[PDB]
Design an enzyme around this catalytic site. Structure first.
Site, PDB file in Angstrom:
ATOM      1  N   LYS A   1      -9.423   3.565  -1.515  1.00 35.98           N
ATOM      2  CA  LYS A   1      -9.692   2.943  -0.211  1.00 35.98           C
ATOM      3  C   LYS A   1     -10.964   3.498   0.419  1.00 35.98           C
ATOM      4  O   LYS A   1     -11.105   4.719   0.602  1.00 35.98           O
ATOM      5  CB  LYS A   1      -8.505   3.107   0.748  1.00 35.98           C
ATOM      6  CG  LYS A   1      -8.651   2.263   2.030  1.00 35.98           C
ATOM      7  CD  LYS A   1      -7.520   2.451   3.027  1.00 35.98           C
ATOM      8  CE  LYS A   1      -7.459   3.849   3.576  1.00 35.98           C
ATOM      9  NZ  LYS A   1      -6.252   4.063   4.407  1.00 35.98           N
TER      10      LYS A   1
ATOM     11  N   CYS B   1      -5.246  -2.327   3.103  1.00 39.90           N
ATOM     12  CA  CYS B   1      -4.869  -2.258   4.521  1.00 39.90           C
ATOM     13  C   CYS B   1      -6.046  -2.323   5.498  1.00 39.90           C
ATOM     14  O   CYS B   1      -6.580  -3.408   5.688  1.00 39.90           O
ATOM     15  CB  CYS B   1      -4.018  -1.009   4.739  1.00 39.90           C
ATOM     16  SG  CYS B   1      -3.027  -1.019   6.250  1.00 39.90           S
TER      17      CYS B   1
ATOM     18  N   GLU C   1       0.836  -1.202   0.000  1.00 42.55           N
ATOM     19  CA  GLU C   1       0.000   0.000   0.000  1.00 42.55           C
ATOM     20  C   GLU C   1       0.879   1.263   0.000  1.00 42.55           C
ATOM     21  O   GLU C   1       1.967   1.243   0.585  1.00 42.55           O
ATOM     22  CB  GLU C   1      -0.847  -0.010   1.298  1.00 42.55           C
ATOM     23  CG  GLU C   1      -1.728   1.200   1.507  1.00 42.55           C
ATOM     24  CD  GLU C   1      -2.218   1.472   2.915  1.00 42.55           C
ATOM     25  OE1 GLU C   1      -1.571   1.030   3.895  1.00 42.55           O
ATOM     26  OE2 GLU C   1      -3.234   2.191   3.038  1.00 42.55           O
TER      27      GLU C   1
END
Ligand SMILES: [Cl-]
Ligand SMILES: [Cl-]
Ligand SMILES: [Cl-]
Ligand SMILES: [Cl-]
Lengths: 268, 268
Positions: B117, B153, B48
């Site tokens: 995200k 994540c 990431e």
């Protein structure tokens, strides 16, 4: 003793459930309460389908009707020992359909929860004999006011079912099961993640032994909000007593505030 | 040889991401491709936020713009090395808003996935700098035609986000992260459960080292549909190479057919 308000003492009864015999099962439970109960225990947990086990072909006759026999049996024990009982589940007939019905009763002999298993195994003749639950699992309070939730066996594979009780404030997720020995690793791994992702206590109460068809895993377990082991059992029948530090829930939720980031309406 | 679609060789680059330096991160990535690539590798995975890491306060000046720099950099490596790249994620600007944007590029230089995200970390104060994504993670095809999904994540803590791609037929879930050493247990426990509950391969690609504020865990791992370890790394910067038996997904789904029991309209 520790001053009341932050802890709960739980007994998990990892019973070898007798195949299709409600009277032998009731006798064993009565005997376990007699041998193990003490004035300091707050909650007793029983495994899935404790009345008939997995004798699905005979439930049309052997199952309970509107929790009649099972609720009266549990109410008597709850009142006698002044303890809350997260009463596993029972084969239960309602309006000519057979359900896998979980229920709990408080120390005052009051029914506090009733939930039919939502997730039937499309493999275990469960679609042949049982009917899937039509309601979500709802959070409910134990005698100390602590919000909890009760889910059954296969439901463990469905992360969706625990999300609503967790975000509503449930602090303990009681999974009641007859989980096979063949899927032992899945049992420990899923219970651990359910605890972490929802920042809560997870208690897996399982049955043990062989029923003439399936070998059950035993290995009941308690996992804290951080994903750490509180206490566990092996394959053999026994009780598990744990003292839960309830403060760890609000502590974990403050440290990892997942529900402030959830996007309920976005997920497909 | 085995029929196309039954096997995949994947390299995982557990890189120590340079804090706020896109040119040095590119130099390091190019060096890793030069040293590590071979003709049998089908996919390379990066961690990431590989361009600037977590230099949040300087992203207004340092982030990419509409994947311009990052896509051109990755398209060049994918075409030179004839490999698919699940390109972790990058700090990325669109119309004065900064996103944490994951993307993937196939060996033919085509952009195959772009995902912002969805779940920002409030404790890391990501909301003060970044904008949360408006779309779900969509399954996409790699060069061999395999459907996969790419998640970032903190998305790991949200089981809902993997459900739709898994029920759509995704066989591999690529989680790209800069997961802290302080939450190592959560990284392994959650990746294992995502694999089990969705009966699919899970690849956790993590960064390592210290950026001047946080110590990253490393410990990249590959989990099969049964929840078993395929391969893993420790804390140290390294490459993990794994061979995936893709037929294990459909075999696991046949054995534990969870999506035949799912109650999409029921859950709260
Ligand atoms: Cl873009
Ligand atoms: Cl080619
Ligand atoms: Cl490929
Ligand atoms: Cl985290």
């Amino acid at each position: 003793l520790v001053p009341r308000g932050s802890h709960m003492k739980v007994q998990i009864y990892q019973l070898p459930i007798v195949f299709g015999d409600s009277s032998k099962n009731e006798t064993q439970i009565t005997q376990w309460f007699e041998k193990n109960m003490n004035a300091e225990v707050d909650v007793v947990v029983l495994p899935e389908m404790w009345n008939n086990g997995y004798d699905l072909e005979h439930l049309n006759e052997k199952a309970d009707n509107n929790l009649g026999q099972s609720f009266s049996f549990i109410k008597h024990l709850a009142e006698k020992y002044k303890v809350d009982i997260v009463a596993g589940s029972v084969s239960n007939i309602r309006n000519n359909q057979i359900f896998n019905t979980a229920f709990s009763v408080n120390k005052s002999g009051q029914l506090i929860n009733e939930y039919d298993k939502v997730h039937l195994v499309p493999m275990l003749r469960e679609h042949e004999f049982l009917t899937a639950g039509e309601y979500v699992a709802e959070p409910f309070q134990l005698s100390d006011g602590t919000y909890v939730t009760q889910l059954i066996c296969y439901d463990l594979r469905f992360p969706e079912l625990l999300r609503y009780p967790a975000r509503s404030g449930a602090k303990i997720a009681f999974y009641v099961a007859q989980w096979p020995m063949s899927r032992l690793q899945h049992w420990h791994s899923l219970l651990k993640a359910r605890a972490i992702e929802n920042n809560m206590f997870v208690i897996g109460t399982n049955s043990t032994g062989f029923d003439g068809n399936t070998e059950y895993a035993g290995h009941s377990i308690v996992i804290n909000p951080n994903g750490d082991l509180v206490g566990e059992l092996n394959e053999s029948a026994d009780i598990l007593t744990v003292d839960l530090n309830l403060n760890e829930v609000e502590q974990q939720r403050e440290n990892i505030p997942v529900f402030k980031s959830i996007k309920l309406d976005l997920y497909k």
